[PDB]
C-alpha cells in the first residue's frame, strides 16, 4: 500500500523524512506510533513522517 503526501513536510529531527505534496511513499513500519517510518518512492530517501500528512493511494 502506497501513500501520497497531502502537504509539504520539512524535517524537524535528524530521523525525519522531508517531502513535498504529491510525493508517493511506501510505509516501512508503522508499529511505533503516529510517526511512521517511510520510504519515498519519488526521492529514494527514508525517514519518519507524520501519518496525518499522507493519504492512501
Amino acid at each position: 500500500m502506497t501513500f501520497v503526501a497531502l502537504y509539504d513536510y520539512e524535517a524537524r529531527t535528524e530521523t525525519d523524512l522531508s517531502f513535498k505534496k504529491g510525493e508517493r511513499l511506501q510505509i516501512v513500519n508503522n508499529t511505533e506510533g503516529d510517526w511512521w517510518l517511510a520510504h519515498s518512492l519519488t526521492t529514494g530517501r527514508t525517514g519518519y513522517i507524520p501519518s496525518n500528512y499522507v493519504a492512501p493511494s
Binding site: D34, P50, N52
Partner: peptide, 10 residues
C-alpha cells in the same frame, strides 16, 4: 496544515 502528532513513545 494539521498539527503534528506527538513523537512516538517506546
Amino acid at each position: 496544515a494539521p498539527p503534528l502528532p506527538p513523537r512516538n513513545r517506546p
